[PDB]
Amino acid sequence: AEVKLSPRDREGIINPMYDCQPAGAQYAGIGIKDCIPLVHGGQGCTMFVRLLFAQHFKENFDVASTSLHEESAVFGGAKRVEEGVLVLARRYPNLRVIPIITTCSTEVIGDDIEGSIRVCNRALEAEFPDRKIYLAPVHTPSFKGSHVTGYAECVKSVFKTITDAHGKGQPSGKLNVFPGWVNPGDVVLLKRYFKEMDVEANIYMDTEDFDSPMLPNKSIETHGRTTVEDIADSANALATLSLARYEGNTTGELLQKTFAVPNALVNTPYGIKNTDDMLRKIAEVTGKEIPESLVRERGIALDALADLAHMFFANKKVAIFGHPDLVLGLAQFCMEVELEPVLLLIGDDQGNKYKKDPRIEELKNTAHFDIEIVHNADLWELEKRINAGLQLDLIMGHSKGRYVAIEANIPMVRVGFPTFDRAGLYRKPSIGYQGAMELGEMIANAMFAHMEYTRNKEWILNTW
Amino acid sequence: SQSHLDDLFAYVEERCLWQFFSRTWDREENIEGVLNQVGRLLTGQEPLRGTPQERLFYADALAMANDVRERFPWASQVNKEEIEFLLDGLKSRLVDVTITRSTNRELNHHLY
Amino acid sequence: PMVLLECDKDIPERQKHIYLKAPNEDTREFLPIANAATIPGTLSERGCAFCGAKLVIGGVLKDTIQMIHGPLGCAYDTWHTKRYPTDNGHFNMKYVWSTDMKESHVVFGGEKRLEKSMHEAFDEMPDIKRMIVYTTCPTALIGDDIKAVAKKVMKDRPDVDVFTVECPGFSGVSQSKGHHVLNIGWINEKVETMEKEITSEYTMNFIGDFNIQGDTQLLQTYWDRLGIQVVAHFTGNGTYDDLRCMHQAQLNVVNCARSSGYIANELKKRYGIPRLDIDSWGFNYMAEGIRKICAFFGIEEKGEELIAEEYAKWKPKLDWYKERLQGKKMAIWTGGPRLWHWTKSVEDDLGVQVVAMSSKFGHEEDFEKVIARGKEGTYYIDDGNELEFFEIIDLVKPDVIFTGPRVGELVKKLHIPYVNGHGYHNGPYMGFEGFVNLARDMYNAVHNPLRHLAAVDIRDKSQTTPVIVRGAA
Numbered sequence A: 001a002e003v004k005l006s007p008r009d010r011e012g013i014i015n016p017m018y019d020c021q022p023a024g025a026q027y028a029g030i031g032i033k034d035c036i037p038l039v040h041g042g043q044g045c046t047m048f049v050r051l052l053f054a055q056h057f058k059e060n061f062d063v064a065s066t067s068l069h070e071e072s073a074v075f076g077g078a079k080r081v082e083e084g085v086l087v088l089a090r091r092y093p094n095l096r097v098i099p100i101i102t103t104c105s106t107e108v109i110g111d112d113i114e115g116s117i118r119v120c121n122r123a124l125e126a127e128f129p130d131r132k133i134y135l136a137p138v139h140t141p142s143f144k145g146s147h148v149t150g151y152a153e154c155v156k157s158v159f160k161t162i163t164d165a166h167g168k169g170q171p172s173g174k175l176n177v178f179p180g181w182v183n184p185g186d187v188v189l190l191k192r193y194f195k196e197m198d199v200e201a202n203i204y205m206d207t208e209d210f211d212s213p214m215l216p217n218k219s220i221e222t223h224g225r226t227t228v229e230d231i232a233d234s235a236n237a238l239a240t241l242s243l244a245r246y247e248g249n250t251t252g253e254l255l256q257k258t259f260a261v262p263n264a265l266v267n268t269p270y271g272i273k274n275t276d277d278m279l280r281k282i283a284e285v286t287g288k289e290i291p292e293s294l295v296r297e298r299g300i301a302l303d304a305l306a307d308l309a310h311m312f313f314a315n316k317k318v319a320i321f322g323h324p325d326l327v328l329g330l331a332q333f334c335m336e337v338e339l340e341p342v343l344l345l346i347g348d349d350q351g352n353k354y355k356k357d358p359r360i361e362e363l364k365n366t367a368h369f370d371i372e373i374v375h376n377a378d379l380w381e382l383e384k385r386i387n388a389g390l391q392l393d394l395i396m397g398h399s400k401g402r403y404v405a406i407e408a409n410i411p412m413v414r415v416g417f418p419t420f421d422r423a424g425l426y427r428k429p430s431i432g433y434q435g436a437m438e439l440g441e442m443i444a445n446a447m448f449a450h451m452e453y454t455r456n457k458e459w460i461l462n463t464w
Numbered sequence B: 001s002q003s004h005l006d007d008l009f010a011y012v013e014e015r016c017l018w019q020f021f022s023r024t025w026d027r028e029e030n031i032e033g034v035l036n037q038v039g040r041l042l043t044g045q046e047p048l049r050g051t052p053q054e055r056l057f058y059a060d061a062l063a064m065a066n067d068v069r070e071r072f073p074w075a076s077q078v079n080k081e082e083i084e085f086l087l088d089g090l091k092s093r094l095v096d097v098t099i100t101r102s103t104n105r106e107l108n109h110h111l112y
Numbered sequence C: 001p002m003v004l005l006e007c008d009k010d011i012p013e014r015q016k017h018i019y020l021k022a023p024n025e026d027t028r029e030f031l032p033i034a035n036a037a038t039i040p041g042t043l044s045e046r047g048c049a050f051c052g053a054k055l056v057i058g059g060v061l062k063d064t065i066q067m068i069h070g071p072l073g074c075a076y077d078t079w080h081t082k083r084y085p086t087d088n089g090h091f092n093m094k095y096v097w098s099t100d101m102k103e104s105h106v107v108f109g110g111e112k113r114l115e116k117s118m119h120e121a122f123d124e125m126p127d128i129k130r131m132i133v134y135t136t137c138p139t140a141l142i143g144d145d146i147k148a149v150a151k152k153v154m155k156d157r158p159d160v161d162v163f164t165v166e167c168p169g170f171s172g173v174s175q176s177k178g179h180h181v182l183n184i185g186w187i188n189e190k191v192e193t194m195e196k197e198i199t200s201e202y203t204m205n206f207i208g209d210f211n212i213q214g215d216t217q218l219l220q221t222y223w224d225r226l227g228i229q230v231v232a233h234f235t236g237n238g239t240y241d242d243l244r245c246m247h248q249a250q251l252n253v254v255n256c257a258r259s260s261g262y263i264a265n266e267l268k269k270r271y272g273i274p275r276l277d278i279d280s281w282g283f284n285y286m287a288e289g290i291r292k293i294c295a296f297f298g299i300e301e302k303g304e305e306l307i308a309e310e311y312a313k314w315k316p317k318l319d320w321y322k323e324r325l326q327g328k329k330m331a332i333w334t335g336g337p338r339l340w341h342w343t344k345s346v347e348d349d350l351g352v353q354v355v356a357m358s359s360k361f362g363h364e365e366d367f368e369k370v371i372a373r374g375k376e377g378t379y380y381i382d383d384g385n386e387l388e389f390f391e392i393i394d395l396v397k398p399d400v401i402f403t404g405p406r407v408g409e410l411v412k413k414l415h416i417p418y419v420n421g422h423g424y425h426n427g428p429y430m431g432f433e434g435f436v437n438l439a440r441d442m443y444n445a446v447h448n449p450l451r452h453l454a455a456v457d458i459r460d461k462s463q464t465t466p467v468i469v470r471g472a473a
Ligand code: CLF
Pocket: A020, A021, A022, A041, A042, A043, A044, A045, A046, A048, A102, A103, A104, A105, A142, C048, C049, C050, C051, C070, C071, C072, C073, C074, C075, C077, C135, C136, C137, C167, C168, C169, C170
């Protein structure tokens, strides 16, 4: 009967849900081909984030530091930016894009990033006359927002930089697609959907090849596939499809204001209805029919979920944490399969935006159970509520919440970022029809294993 | 002989850590303290095991003395004076390479 | 000689950081620069000073709140990244704390935000009464006086004890600075602020061991067998209050001389406790260390009984691995000390030839040690970077690399296997059993069917797919 938004009631954080803005800016940048982000700050701001990406993906990604040291903290760090850009350019001959990402240190000391970019542009034009390197200023102070906001800021700044340089050309006939912060498997699903619907689209950023092969020829293919050319062509698109309000919609709006490319923000496609509505929007903007192949994939997903919903899911209580577009989308998916998402945790200071999200209203009008949405949440909020008596049958969230579930003896499905404590999840779609099916089956299989380990009617797994 | 000294020096360099302490004064103390006990042990003299520092120089020295006797047949053949002479040359060489000509810029920092 | 790599032609200052050991050289003329400023934009492996204080040393403790005064990233980034178990359910790995610094705190100060966070942390976990507070980049820059806040909290809450560390990430050049600041503050402020019961004639501290995969708990089986009381472990499987008792020990045994030599040196200066450096990795090294400890205490026969049993249990397996690992080439790209603890121990005990080594943050002291113990024809790199790693692989062609997981995932593409040189694969790796565990992981890494499979191009009609025969000790 009531969906209530409330903030965390503590000033401090125990067990943060998200990383800081610069980490999200790094994630945006590593999806660009021939890009090495340069993180202007102390060394930990780079190295810890490279480790985080290795935890999620089990791969290396290249990011550099400006190595701020004590002298720059007293006199300013511009010379560290300028050196860092040239040392990148000189040692990586194919490098084309450097997002220059600020940190808490370099925001506090007020280094003039745009001034350093003018110096480096002059230096690079003189030293490498036949090269163009795009330097994008990315302002990501860590004392506001989160890696979610930092992702969105970097995407927007890179797009502004590159489209500023190339402007509007000939119509491409393509869609721009900003899926937000999703896995390689989600990108693979979207590419299939557009191919089956005969819709040309660029997916920003294209992270499919983050899951790179170990090849006979020892080649390294672990790269973003989105090129300068692909980003520049965004000016020429027929439309933008933005799937994530907090993860790239603001770039869709920028391209609408600058280049009159109409932006369509839709619910993030977690679950069946949200996928349906995404495909209807694609059909509306392109004039292309939804193919039979997607009716069939949808029907296969529904068939699978129907084996689970009333038998194993109905009336089971769920807590969900992760990025806001993921939390809100998964809550809607859960209700489609008769799960009851009673506790939604969103991890940053953007509550004044979340209060206006139309999906809150979609929950307030649908749910038959109270939902608490805690914004500015940490993961201690979850643990403390369980310790105070909250009864949960399932947790859905990323791997940094694992000990909460382990100790409480609650089954947990790993979703969102980072999912380092299970194998291969970055390759499994979560969005779309196949993604809904895969999520539902992870939920059931986690419950099934729990029933066996706890001897809770484990004999029932025979004739369902 | 120079060969015997070269044997002792190559052993200490590849095996021991006490010559590589954090400051000049500690390297000097250890080179003197350990190698004086080595001399005692290799010449059948009563080791000094009074103070905690003495006991520790004995412990380091015992490993080296046992290893030198096991590795180098000459160390059981040369006389007391010859052992002493070699160990004096070894102190000089260890001070030369770990202190006098070390470019380790922390060695004379007054504070730890 | 010193080496100018092709990838460093435009950063030629790197030549004084890279030594290739050649016959007959006076190594005093070729000591890498170390512990100097990083070059921006290189993809250096270095971390920050805050990491060296909280992640490496302080965060190991099993009963202490780790309050990171700063924005939430520094906290997020040092959580779910270490493998230092405890015997109390891994409290240290389950939790991290942040003051969640916001823009208003940059403007107006963060001292009241810290104070409030501290009391919240003690209120949320009423069984925990110890805390370390760390500064980070922006709380250092705005001048919050965390020692004065801690003083007020301890006045207001007399059942807690709080320690503070100033270690913003821009301090020093690397993690090394954090070690130093923490070590000296601890001995200045907290040693000899309580005492414990002495239950043995033989007492020691074990200084510079962080319980990676249970290393400290494995070594503790030796001290219990020998009847030695360990007053404090700095800091593996440790407690805040045990560290306040360090002055009581008769002997300080040091393994990590880089991170923790500082406090051993000050304990000797101030309390007369001798510093004994050992190697607690390496099979024959562990025997030497036990014999020195036992010679210091006058319990030599107890030491020889322990060594004999451990060799009877483990040496046959060690020698099985040596037969199969002899002549394999290894690289070690870690922080610094494991270079000099491992180069000669894998050579002696496993027949492995270490052909390239890189230290993130070692000092000239660490290079003295590793060059003294290391081979001719080996590369010794201070503050190595990613392009240098590729050029070095092309020069020395290692069969295995001991390094962190991200680099391990990079060199996998070149079909080179890795062992996690930091957090281990299947540890512990200290002690007699531990070196057998290290050898097993090395063996399974290199003699791995997947490596052979990856090299086959199925399109080549001249190629078949091989089968390899493995073994087990
Ligand atoms: S070098 Fe080290 S990890 Fe970096 S900030 Fe500095 S103490 Fe910390 Fe912190 S919140 Fe994020 S991760 Fe940085 S931008 Fe600031």
